[PDB]
Structures are given as structure tokens and as C-alpha cells.
């Protein structure tokens, strides 16, 4: 919100029998993709630490 990074974003933990996908998906304007991904990954790193 503070930087108008994306129109929307979501975390997801899709599970499967023997595997799965853990991540996130955001929708943004062509010119803020970078800052968004940056802040996002940051939070992930903020999680492990």
C-alpha cells in the first residue's frame, strides 16, 4: 500500500500426496514488479530469521 507495489498478492501452500508447492503470487503494474518481488522475498527471509 505504502508503495503501490501490487494490485493483489497471495501466499499459498498447495499440497499433494508426495510433494507440494509453497510460495506466493502477485499481480502488478509493469513498473513495480521489481520492488514487489523484492519486498516479498524479503518477508520470506524475514520468516526464517
Amino acid at each position: 500500500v505504502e508503495h503501490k507495489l501490487c494490485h493483489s498478492f497471495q501466499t499459498f501452500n498447495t499440497s499433494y500426496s508426495d510433494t507440494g508447492l509453497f510460495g506466493f503470487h502477485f499481480v502488478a503494474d509493469p513498473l513495480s514488479i521489481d520492488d514487489m518481488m523484492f519486498c516479498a522475498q524479503g518477508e520470506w527471509m524475514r520468516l526464517c530469521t
Binding site: 509493469p30 513498473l31 514488479i33 521489481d34
Partner: protein
């Protein structure tokens, strides 16, 4: 802000793998070396020539210069 204002690109998919899922120097023989030769081959005849032609000129002038130091007996065949 140089990334994003570059150019109008449409319909191009690219696939790449994390560096840790692949080899650093793959197919050294099957693929690598052959191209190294391919490339060497391609250029050899554009480059090498003028270099070789220079070498000659070097060798020629270099020796011809020495020859001009040695004496010619035909200058003393009567100097008794």
C-alpha cells in the same frame, strides 16, 4: 529506472534452470571443443594472412639489413 522502459516485446517464452540444477562446464567434448574449432576455423583466414605477410616483411628486411653489413669481395679483388 532503466529496466522496464527498454523495448516492446511480445510472445517469447524462455526457460532456464537454477545454476545448482545444472553443470558448470557441460559437454566439453561433444559440444564445447567442436565450436572452439569451428570458430578458430572461421576466422583463421581473415586474421592470420596479414600477420603472416608482416612476418615475411620482418624477416626479409631484418636479414637484408644484415647482408648489407657483410663485405663483398668484389671490392678488394685487386687491392693488392
Amino acid at each position: 529506472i532503466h529496466f522496464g522502459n527498454l523495448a516492446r516485446v511480445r510472445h517469447i517464452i524462455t526457460y532456464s534452470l537454477s545454476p545448482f540444477e545444472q553443470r558448470a562446464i557441460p559437454n566439453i567434448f561433444s559440444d564445447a571443443l567442436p565450436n572452439v574449432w569451428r570458430r578458430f576455423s572461421s576466422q583463421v583466414f581473415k586474421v592470420a594472412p596479414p600477420f603472416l605477410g608482416a612476418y615475411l616483411l620482418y624477416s626479409w628486411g631484418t636479414q637484408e639489413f644484415e647482408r648489407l653489413k657483410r663485405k663483398n669481395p668484389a671490392d678488394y679483388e685487386n687491392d693488392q
